[PDB]
Write a protein that binds this DNA or RNA. Structure first.
Lengths: 216, 92
RNA sequence: CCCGAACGGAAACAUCUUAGUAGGGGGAGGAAAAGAAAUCAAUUGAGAUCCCCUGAGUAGGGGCGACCGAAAGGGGGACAGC
RNA sequence: UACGGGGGCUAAAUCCUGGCCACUGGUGGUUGGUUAAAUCCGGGUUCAACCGGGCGAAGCCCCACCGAAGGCCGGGGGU
RNA sequence: CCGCAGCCUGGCGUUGUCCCUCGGGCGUUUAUGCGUAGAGUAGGUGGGAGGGGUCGAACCUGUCCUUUCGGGGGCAGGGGACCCGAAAGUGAAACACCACCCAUGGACGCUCGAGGGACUAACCUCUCGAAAGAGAGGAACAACGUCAGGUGGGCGGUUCGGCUGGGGCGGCACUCCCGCGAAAAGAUAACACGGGAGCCCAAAGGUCGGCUCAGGCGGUACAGAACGCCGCCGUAGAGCGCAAGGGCAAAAGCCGGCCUGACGUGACCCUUCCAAGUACGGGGUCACGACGCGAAAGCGGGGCCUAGCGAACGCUCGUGCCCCCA
RNA sequence: GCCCGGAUCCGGGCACCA
């Protein structure tokens, strides 16, 4: 629940030094959630959605995808951080930290529909409270367009708290572009429920900023 | 007496036999602002004796057990006539 | 104009009815009191108060029991206004 | 104005007035539970009625004392 | 069974001035965190393998506070500059920095209360004064008004069932079911006799198939009157939830398979209740709609039949619509 | 029907006009 021009004003604080500090590296914008009056039992905080962000920040995230022999030469064009083949993913048996490390830093762990039943026995217990959901991929030849959906998408999940800390953007877009980065998130939460009453204050800061104010 | 949790009977809205979920009847809250509660309170203002008769002699020991059946496709509910029993063990 | 029962009936009886009656206290007159819409009713109408025939045992109140109970409107009598 | 006013029981004098505080009653106390109206908070209602929550006195639950307070003063088994 | 006084206690009013403390909140302010596996304090969700580095680091030596003295958190100097892993473990890892949460304490401005203390001018008590007025003591309590809870035969209104070899005590022949009384149609009384019900069962209900029970006889290790097996007889001498009476054998009993007709709506008839009025309750026969079981005709709105149950008003639930005003 | 405490049941104090 925010105004049309509020997001541009929200990014104006983030981009400008009035609510940001310019260090040796480019800043990244993040949002933290602060709400009031939500309980786990009532069964409304089932936030497990994805957002197709049209604007792509220059800094790509750790996105992991597991293709098959059908499209072994299609997923390499999207420049993923780390990719493991279906034919050799079963080799992780016994290993625990390599299972943990390259599943929480990475945004997603996409696995094909053929190995869907195998996507809950190895990464199941290892990502129980962590909250990783493998999204099945289309069985067509083209996968980069599907990966492009997940290059800058964020996996949101909550279990016992009403807040999620997620990536939304950086310092490298237009001041009005955050109105397109956050609109997918705003539309997604709009189209699944309506808990705008529980809101108290929305903090849209940078990586190294402080609490800001969003008009509401 | 034991009764199943699910029973297949006639759904009169669907006009065929469907599955139903079985539960025991329980009444609601008395809801002040009911017309007979507005009248009772209007009668208790002022001076006088106890205004209304109140039961004192009781003979029955059980109560009629009523079954509530909800049609699992359309949520239509049929309520059955009660029957004097101890406590209907509704466990499947 | 204020204060204010019980007997009886409900086939018992306490809410109820009897009844604002009986009774008590205060204040007048040849009559008193009321009286000139912060009223009624309904497609934009009537036009101060009082009394009679009605509306009508209707609306409505009630251990929804025994029982209790209007007003507007219609027809008349007089019909002023400051 | 306590050597008093008020309220009980017994019934001159002599010799005495035993055991029991479980019940009822009276008095006092309290970790604690419950506890009305009013006020306060949340929901609801373009406002209310209406739903909840908190706070919650005396009393009651709980503890102790009192028989010249009402009173009560058995049975069974063995040596 | 109920009321009403009196009494006790709390809110509001009369009712005012100064404080202090505490507990809530609102916009801020901040610094503090060991179930186990391990370089070791993983409390959790993410950006984030880079973050700090004359844009002054890792390291010895002490003052100091603290803790399950585990151990971390802050001090300047001596050091003029270094460490975490992308690497090893964890149902959940990076003291790589930054955010919110659970959770400790304090402070700013505002609000709300709750408690304690003081004061005097309301109010009260006394004294002097013919009055007017003056003085002393208490004091925002008491007292009074109003509302709320408790206590309350102090006082008022009432109710104190019936049948019945008089009434009482007893019993219930006070609602319902079976036999007999009862006189071979129907009806028929006794504080007559012999007894029961106020429920139990998801099967002890529906259907289809197979089978035959109690008891006795002959032959078999333990084997016995009574275990299993092989034969002969057996009109019921068994079983059918529960009283009594009736009914039942390729079953109405016993053992299995599949099921939920213990079904939605709407009628008529019998009995209670003879001919001859009459509430409930119970039962029987069906129509429409839909099922179950059977090859099928068909059987099935509970239990083999006769007991196991309750008006108006009020509340509540189910189910589709109707109404709310000069 | 409540609160609360105790092992769905029990106890205590209040709710409850067919």
């Amino acid at each position: 629940l925010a105004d049309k021009e509020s997001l541009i004003e929200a990014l104006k604080l983030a981009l400008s030094t009035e609510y940001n500090v310019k260090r040796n590296f480019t800043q990244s914008v993040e949002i933290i959630l602060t709400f009031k009056g939500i309980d786990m039992k009532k069964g409304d905080l089932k936030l497990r959605e994805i957002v197709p962000l049209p604007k792509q920040p220059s800094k790509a995230k750790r996105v992991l995808v597991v293709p098959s022999f059908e499209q072994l030469e299609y997923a390499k064009k999207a420049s993923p951080n780390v990719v493991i083949t279906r034919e050799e993913l079963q080799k992780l048996q016994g290993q625990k930290r390599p299972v943990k490390k390259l599943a929480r830093q990475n945004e997603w762990f996409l696995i094909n529909q053929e190995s869907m039943a195998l996507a809950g026995r190895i990464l199941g217990p290892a990502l129980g409270p962590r909250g990783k959901f493998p999204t099945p991929l289309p069985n067509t030849a083209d996968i980069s367009e599907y990966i492009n959906r997940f290059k800058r998408s964020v996996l949101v999940k909550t279990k016992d708290q009403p807040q999620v800390q997620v990536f939304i953007g950086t310092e490298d877009m237009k001041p009005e572009d955050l109105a397109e980065n956050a609109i997918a998130v705003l539309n997604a939460i709009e189209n699944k429920a309506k808990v705008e009453t529980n809101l108290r204050n929305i903090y849209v800061k940078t990586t190294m900023g402080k609490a800001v104010k969003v008009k509401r | 007496m034991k009764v199943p949790k699910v029973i297949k009977t006639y759904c009169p809205k669907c006009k065929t036999h469907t599955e139903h979920s079985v539960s025991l009847y329980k009444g609601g809250k008395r809801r002040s602002l009911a017309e007979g509660q507005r009248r009772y309170e209007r009668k208790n203002v002022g001076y006088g004796s106890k205004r209304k008769p109140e039961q004192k002699r009781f003979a029955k020991t059980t109560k009629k057990q009523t079954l509530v059946l909800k049609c699992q496709k359309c949520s239509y509910t049929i309520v059955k006539e009660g029957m004097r029993l101890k406590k209907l063990e509704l466990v499947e």
